[PDB]
Give the backbone structure.
Amino acid sequence: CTLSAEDKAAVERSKMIDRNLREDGEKAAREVKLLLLGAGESGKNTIVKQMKTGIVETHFTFKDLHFKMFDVGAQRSERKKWIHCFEGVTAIIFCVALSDYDLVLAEDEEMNRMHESMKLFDSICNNKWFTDTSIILFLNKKDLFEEKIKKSPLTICYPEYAGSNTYEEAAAYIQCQFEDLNKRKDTKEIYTHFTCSTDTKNVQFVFDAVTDVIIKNNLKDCGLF
Amino acid sequence: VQLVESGGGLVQPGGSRKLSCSASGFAFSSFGMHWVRQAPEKGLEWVAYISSGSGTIYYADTVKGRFTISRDDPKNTLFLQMTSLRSEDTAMYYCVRSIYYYGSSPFDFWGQGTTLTVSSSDIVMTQATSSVPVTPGESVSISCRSSKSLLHSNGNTYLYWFLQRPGQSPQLLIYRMSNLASGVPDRFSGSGSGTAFTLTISRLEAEDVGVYYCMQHLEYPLTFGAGTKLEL
Amino acid sequence: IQTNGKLLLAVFYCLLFVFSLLGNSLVILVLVVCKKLRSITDVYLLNLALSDLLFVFSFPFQTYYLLDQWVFGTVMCKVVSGFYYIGFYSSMFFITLMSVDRYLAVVHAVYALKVRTIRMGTTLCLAVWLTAIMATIPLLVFYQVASEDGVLQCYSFYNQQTLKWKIFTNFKMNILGLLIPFTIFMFCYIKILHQLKRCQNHNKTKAIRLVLIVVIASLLFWVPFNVVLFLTSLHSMHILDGCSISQQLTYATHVTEIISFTHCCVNPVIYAFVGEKFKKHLSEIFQK
Amino acid sequence: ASIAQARKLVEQLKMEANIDRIKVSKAAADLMAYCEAHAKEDPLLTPVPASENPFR
Amino acid sequence: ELDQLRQEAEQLKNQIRDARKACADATLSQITNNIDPVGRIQMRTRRTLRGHLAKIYAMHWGTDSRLLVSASQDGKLIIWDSYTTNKVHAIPLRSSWVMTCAYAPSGNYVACGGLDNICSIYNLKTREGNVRVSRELAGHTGYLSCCRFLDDNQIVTSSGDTTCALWDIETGQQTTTFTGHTGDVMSLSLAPDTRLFVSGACDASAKLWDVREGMCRQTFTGHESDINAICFFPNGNAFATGSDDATCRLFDLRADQELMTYSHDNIICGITSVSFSKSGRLLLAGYDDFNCNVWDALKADRAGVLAGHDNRVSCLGVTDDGMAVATGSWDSFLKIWN
Ligand SMILES: COc1ccccc1Oc1cccc(CN2CCC3(CC2)C(=O)NCN3CCc2ccccc2)c1
């Protein structure tokens, strides 16, 4: 053996530590990870409330599925130095406020808020770290958007837009504009859901999206990519 | 940290008892546990040991088969079920905690013990000093000899010095022959050469009076010395 | 004719042995040597590779038996028959177990999260191997070498009173080798196909195609084998008797054996070689 | 507003500009001398025998 | 006037550049031209530390050169006996997003931190037998990138808010806030005398700070991209910077300018970690190409290469006695090379 008594006991302690690490790793792998991003005031807090400093953690359980939502909106640092820590998350919940087609950013009027959302979406969807990572696209503030389109038309946000100013068609146009920012339409897939303040099926939509993502992941793992 | 133990009493020979050791103030699950006897006027002898998570159980040769040691981690308690008691087991039992990793200090805290009376290849560790006079303010050296070299090839000499004050639970002084335990004044020092070791007290006071024991920890019959008593 | 058939069978046996060796060795080398058995599917795939290798290990001795008389002896005839039969049983059981695993992964994703681990897969694989050994225990006791017409042959001797055990061991290869496994095999993949059709993904079409490939491959490999088994059992029961019938059943026996074990070389290219993860592992190995 | 930032930057630049600098020759010579003096005590540069290598 | 202030700043920069050029009588390349090359260095993986189930972001050797701490995204801080591969402790962190770890020189404490902007300091030697969080230093408004222990009571951290801080642990307060960087500070290294420390940030600048006083003494530029790794020369009169421009740079404190750039055409990936051997001769840099390159510090020639990590080599350290070289990569493994 060539091992002392206390050396053998230390080996046993290390084995117990290994067993605990394996148990916690299995528990963690049983979980689902969502990275929640939004262009500032994008209704992100509203959805955070409905499912239940720096990085904010949220745990909830829905239909025997344990979620872990990470909010990084308060980082206010170089995103490129910590966005690789979230490589491998199950999904990315991107919140976009539909009421920002009119409002312009406080920092200069030359550069629009929905354009900020589109730029952030382009950065995150086309990021090298998120290539096969699915995006669940929440389009919040749909009631305010529906009310406001009557007064100001969608042409301000999209000069090239040529269509009816009805709520449904404009919402479809904005959704299409967001999904045409996806360079790789084969490795990753984008789920779009419209929400409001009184919506009560957002958790169900997230559950369906994550279930589909899990099915795809374990189809890749089972040899049926 | 407390290690209060319960049980004991007068038992007729051939009977059975359950000695209980309640632990509070520290993590039980991460700590291995030992039972150490104390005869009414004699030294200490290791009885049984269980590791963290009840992985390994060891017993002394003289107590094999009859005793069974167990632990309850959720209840934070230690049990010793004793069967076929004879007059050789009449002792003051001591519950000892011991953690094992690199740089750890085994045999930190010894419980107060329970009194138990019954109606009527191991390393030999020898301290021939038995009793030596002491005067306050002087320096004293206590020697302990080993049957085989306690220095393992990894470089760790496995020797432990314990001080038992009059009417007190044993207290760890030196672990692995040169390392001072927590809360022990720096006047205590330990040295050795693999087989013969010394423990030096630079300046004693009335607090240092007591009986000193040396333990080996190479193999696992854990054997103590006869002990050396200090009298002012 | 007889010499032509002997050389013909020897040639196909040799090529099948070589191809199965390459495929199963590549699977094993990727799984246990170059990489780790990360997932439960890796455990099932390694077990299937071992099953295919065990099945094909008996091919060289059969080729020698075609070339010349049996010389290896009684005990190795026992172990060769065990190799063949344990390989057959383990391969079918692992195919069924992979069908169940994919059914869990696709139909019940949340439940399969908590019921699909490496330990459970290893336990089920050990159970499958033990079941295969138990199933081939009855067949080994009758496989005895004997001198017929001056030629040593290793075969399942059945005396006039033991003919009942031959027919029973033939139906066991049918109801326990095909009927029970393929009922689970069929049910699991039909429900996978139904689930994949009603799904929003780009991987759905590839998975549908691969599921259909698996189903048709397994059926064409294993159905003619067991059909000619059933017909042979009926002939032994004297229900279908005839010299021309006997010759036709022997020829069908040979051709359906070839179509049957071809699986030991097709199963790798269907379960591992096609599929993105194994291609990525192979590319990583090639780069290094 | 930005005037205070500019003043602070100018003061810091002045504080950085008043240091005493020795030539690259002397600094490089010092680095070389330190490397040469302690070259015998670097296990990575000069591999030790397996007897005193703790990682065998 | 703002224009006058900008003109004065430009004039001061011109004067600094002129002084630096005047002091550059020769270069480290020609001075060490006649020195014998180190030779082919081949280091074998003596130990492989398994147990982490996520990407390892941090690692720090202890003073005794046997116990080392490792941080990875699975939310655990594992303390390893390197001599015999063992796990002494497995501290479960509150925030799984750990990007830095530190081992105190005494060994009684270990610090971690990350996207929580909190430096959590844990006590290893406790009467309860379990590792307990001693302190939770908060006040940074950005992600913590590196924390180094001065002693058992003071710790120095660098954050993504373009600042560094000195904390006294026994009150959990920011004694001195070091400001002056424009981008996020990603690495800091303490001098052997623990009186100055160099911090490299994302504005391609490395600033030398006096710990006691609290202002930047020297600012070193030259990198074309963010500085992700810094390490003091053992002498304390130089340091090395790794960047995303696939180059390492050696800056001299007394010469107040660069001395050499270690680069090669085959290397395009950035440097994540940089460390020196215990002679100043070998510069070990972890690269994103799943490799760790060992350069000769005096001669820009590449001394050796360490391969064996299947993902990006994120952390890299050298023991105080220089016996071994620990490398931790994103493949959840630590390899001890010798
Ligand atoms: C001496 O070689 C072996 C001895 C024992 C088992 C496998 C040895 O290797 C080989 C290698 C290939 C082919 C055979 C020959 N076959 C003959 C038919 C067979 C299996 C072995 C048998 O025996 N009894 C019934 N059984 C299957 C009957 C059947 C039914 C439908 C289609 C095809 C076959 C043996």
Observations:
- The domain at 4-337 of chain E is CATH 2.130.10.10 (Methylamine Dehydrogenase; Chain H).
- The pocket of OS9 is lined by residues C 58-59, 61-62, 65, 80-81, 84, 154, 225, 228-229, 232, 253, 256-257 (CB under 6 Å).
- Residues 113 and 222 of chain E are 29 Å apart (CA to CA).
